Amino acid sequence: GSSANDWQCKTCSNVNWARRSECNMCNTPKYAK
Ligand SMILES: [Zn+2]
Protein backbone atom coordinates (compact mmCIF):
# COMPACT_ATOMS: atom_id res chain seq x y z
CA GLY A 1 0.00 0.00 0.00
CA SER A 2 2.80 2.41 -0.87
CA SER A 3 2.67 1.87 -4.62
CA ALA A 4 0.13 3.56 -6.87
CA ASN A 5 -1.68 0.29 -7.55
CA ASP A 6 -2.19 -1.77 -4.41
CA TRP A 7 -3.80 0.32 -1.71
CA GLN A 8 -4.39 -0.25 1.97
CA CYS A 9 -7.44 0.62 4.02
CA LYS A 10 -7.06 3.48 6.43
CA THR A 11 -9.46 1.87 8.87
CA CYS A 12 -8.53 -1.81 9.22
CA SER A 13 -5.08 -1.23 7.70
CA ASN A 14 -5.70 -4.33 5.62
CA VAL A 15 -4.91 -4.19 1.91
CA ASN A 16 -7.94 -5.15 -0.16
CA TRP A 17 -7.51 -5.86 -3.86
CA ALA A 18 -4.64 -4.35 -5.87
CA ARG A 19 -7.22 -1.89 -7.22
CA ARG A 20 -10.38 -2.32 -5.13
CA SER A 21 -12.84 0.58 -5.07
CA GLU A 22 -13.58 0.25 -1.36
CA CYS A 23 -12.90 -1.90 1.71
CA ASN A 24 -14.94 -5.07 2.16
CA MET A 25 -14.38 -4.87 5.92
CA CYS A 26 -14.94 -1.20 6.77
CA ASN A 27 -16.67 -0.23 3.52
CA THR A 28 -14.20 2.65 3.30
CA PRO A 29 -13.89 4.23 -0.16
CA LYS A 30 -10.42 3.82 -1.71
CA TYR A 31 -9.37 7.36 -0.84
CA ALA A 32 -12.12 9.25 0.96
CA LYS A 33 -9.68 11.96 2.00
ZN1 LIG B 1 -10.94 -1.68 6.04
Query: Widest CA span of the chain, in angstroms?
Result: 21
Distance 8 CA to ligand 1 centre (A): 8
DSSP labels for 3-33?
Answer: SSSS-B-SSS--B--TT-SB-SSS--BTT--
Q: Where are the domains of the chain?
A: 1-33
Let me know: does 23 contact 11? Beta carbons within 8 Å: yes
Technique behind the model:
NMR
Distance 15 CA to ligand 1 centre (A): 8
Let me know: does 15 contact 8? Beta carbons within 8 Å: yes
Distance 27 CA to ligand 1 centre (A): 6
Distance 4 CA to ligand 1 centre (A): 18
